[PDB]
Ligand code: HEM
Ligand code: HEM
Ligand SMILES: Cc1cc(N)nc(C[C@@H]2CNC[C@H]2NCCNCCc2cccc(F)c2)c1
Ligand SMILES: Cc1cc(N)nc(C[C@@H]2CNC[C@H]2NCCNCCc2cccc(F)c2)c1
Ligand SMILES: C[C@H](O)[C@H](O)[C@H]1CNc2nc(N)[nH]c(=O)c2N1
């Protein structure tokens with residue numbers, strides 16, 4: 039009835055009973071698995087989601103069934119009945135945000151889930167204020183290189199109006215400029231957003247690592263452009279511990295991974311602007327951002343710099359160059375005293391997390407394809423661990439781009 | 442718009458719809474509530490007859506004769522045979538077609554570009570364990586072809602009502618012994634502890650090496666299994682050395698040339714071939730990454746990183762990554778030197794991408810298990826990482842089956 043879950047390195051077996059609390063369907067059916075795909079109210083429905091969540095919260099503070107619990111449930115019924123919606127108390131918001139992260143199946147960093155600074159920005163009435171709030175988040179989370187996990191939560195969605203939105207997918211991204219010759223200068227994943235910025239008045243640069251401005255949108259208004267002060271945006275120059283020529287490549291990356299386009303759902307309420315950040319796992323930069331062929335695509339350049347036989351696949355020049363780039367990322371971050379975790383350290387700590395969650399909740403939703411690192415997969419323990427994937431609430435979700 | 446899974450490649454930005462999955466008639470382990478895709482392991486006349494009809498229809502379509510009187514006569518022949526015996530039998534060319542189709546249908550195989558080139562050995566006349574041995578030896582000889590490896594399958598008689606199965610007890614035709622030591626550790630391949638112990642229980646005099654080739658335990662219907670040692674001259678092995686690291690040869694590592702799965706059930710039109718060993722050639726990561734570096738296999742990563750003088754005390758030196766790359770390269774280099782067919786994970790995956798286009802055009806999709814198709818080193822460096830895949834069961838199929846003991 040409940041799925042048997044095996045680790046193939048150790049022979050150990052658990053049963054996932056947590057998955058029974060999923061109320062939201064994923065993409066798979068018995069006929070076909072779609073788990074490798076990247077992408078996919080009325081009163082009584084919102085109310086039942088609100089109840090579930092208030093239940094979750096009072097249980098977390100061990101006050102299940104108490105007066106404060108009963109009274110709070112009534113406040114929610116009263117507010118929904120009269121207004122079609124309700125509001126969270128700060129402490130509930132805090133619990134909700136932590137729980138959304140905990141429940142994130144694609145996140146390998148979840149051992150940190152209980153350590154999250156939550157800035158309540160629900161008294162935000164303008165794109166200008168959104169910016170102040172965004173800048174403080176960056177200041178806090180960066181902390182001179184000693185990164186701290188943080189989320190800032192802007193005003194929820196409301197029936198009769200447009201959303202607060204951050205158009206950018208992260209608070210910090212590098213520009214991608216489409217050239218007339220069809221090639222991209224900069225980061226190719228950011229061509230569209232670079233263009234949008236330009237359309238809304240941004241004076242472009244012409245470098246490979248021009249940090250983008252933020253397009254911020256208050257309800258039903260044109261987005262506004264804000265340039266981040268360079269002082270707030272910590273970058274790390276890339277060098278290699280043994281290869282001197284590496285630094286000459288002029289490669290660099292920003293310190294702060296902060297997602298800014300995902301919706302945060304708590305008890306049926308929706309937070310369309312709720313950016314969050316932690317710290318990088320080196321492979322995100324060393325492997326995906328720098329080596330993906332549809333990103334900076336630096337493999338060949340590096341392999342040529344290493345004088346590798348680039349003529350045949352069997353020389354494993356791709357694999358060899360990839361390792362040095364991952365090493366350069368780690369070394370550079372360690373040298374600049376900026377928090378990073380390598381994919382071995384990270385997956386080992388995720389295994390501990392799976393164990394903690396088994397005892398705590400009877401399971402952990404996890405998306406195997408995203409948990410296993412993009413290089414050296416079977417060299418990490420998560421490769422050998424079976425995983426059950428499902429949707430729990432509170433959750434982060436994708437939402438449509440606002441343009 | 443289309444009411445079929447949309448499939449995107451994120452490298453190239455291109456889109457397809459899988460319409461083939463509509464043909465699936467066996468449910469996998471996933472529900473809308475939870476995805477179980479990462480789990481390794483998750484007759485009556487009526488059921489048999491419909492399975493048969495569908496296979497026969499598959500066969501006649503593949504020769505472009507759907508609806509023809511030969512098609513409808515063969516259907517008639519099939520039901521009349523089930524009507525009177527409870528089973529039926531495949532024509533020679535129906536077996537050949539079904540064996541290839543089963544390979545083509547296997548979601549976990551990255552080598553499927555090759556699916557149309559399979560030598561199908563018909564061994565449905567086989568009536569003893571001794572004869573299975575002869576057939577298996579002939580299989581190994583033909584498939585090995587002195588290192589110019591050839592895809593092949595040998596098909597032994599089908600499961601019958603109230604008669605024992607033909608079974609090969611070993612999971613592969615060639616595997617190394619794993620000896621459980623006095624100190625609890627394992628000498629040889631830890632994956633093969635059980636089969637080694639079974640071999641010894643059935644009178645095998647064991648060796649004491651890291652790379653001892655196992656004997657076969659072969660079972661004819663309703664008999665105890667008989668033990669057969671493969672003549673060593675038949676078992677091509679490759680000594681492992683590295684192109685520039687001179688000391689690697691001194692580790693004394695080696696692997697067999699021929700990957701030959703022998704414990705899977707080949708199902709075709711409801712008929713069950715309990716003994717149908719099939720063989721191809723290796724993708725290099727199978728040996729160099731999994732068999733050699735898995736913690737629960739040979740586990741040689743630390744040894745090699747020490748030899749390479751790496752800092753094995755800290756994760757962030759990427760010592761595991763560095764050694765793994767060299768062990769893989771050693772595998773490739775050694776097989777190439779020995780003139781034994783092998784394919785690297787870059788070529789293999791590049792060619793599977795091409796197989797995906799072929800199949801899109803031919804069948805409207807291709808069942809694929811992303812976790813198994815993506816190699817265990819350098820995942821996102823290969824194009825399959827960036828390709829969404831739809832996984833589902835088609836028949837003919839290879840299936841896991843329970844161990845005979
Ligand atoms: C503390 C350090 C953290 C590390 C090392 C980490 C690691 C990762 C990695 C490697 C991914 C996959 C990213 C990709 O391949 O694009 C990921 C995804 C994700 N993380 Fe974490 N994470 C951390 C903190 C956080 C925090 C603070 C939150 C929210 C409060 C969070 C929520 C998520 C979500 C929702 C995803 C999947 C959404 C997406 O990026 O598409 N993580 N994480
Ligand atoms: C021609 C060269 C071939 C290559 C390079 C190749 C490659 C692979 C690889 C890398 C795997 C995953 C194995 C693992 O991780 O343990 C696999 C699985 C599989 N292969 Fe192929 N293969 C080839 C030929 C064949 C042939 C001839 C057949 C059958 C006629 C076949 C049928 C299968 C099946 C059924 C599986 C899944 C069963 C399992 O779990 O091992 N392959 N193949
Ligand atoms: C908090 C935190 C820490 C960390 N290390 N890492 C993260 C997420 C990663 C980082 N860097 C990008 C984020 N992940 C974004 C994943 N993209 C979704 C796929 C997609 C969908 C639609 C369009 C498109 F182009 C792509 C968060
Ligand atoms: C024909 C061919 C060519 C090739 N390159 N490769 C192959 C399959 C590989 C080879 N070498 C092992 C096979 N595959 C092993 C299948 N194991 C998964 C299920 C299972 C079941 C029981 C125990 C266990 F640990 C795991 C076949
Ligand atoms: C198509 C496939 O699902 C896609 O490439 C996924 C695979 N696993 C991933 N895993 C992580 N962490 N990040 C990713 O972007 C992806 N991409």
Ligand SMILES: C[C@H](O)[C@H](O)[C@H]1CNc2nc(N)[nH]c(=O)c2N1
Nearest residue numbers: 421422423424479480481812813
């Ligand atoms: C848990 C996970 O499914 C398991 O370790 C799988 C992952 N992918 C694999 N892929 C291949 N090709 N071979 C394997 O043995 C595995 N093991």
Ligand SMILES: [Zn+2]
Nearest residue numbers: 066071471476
């Ligand atoms: Zn699934």
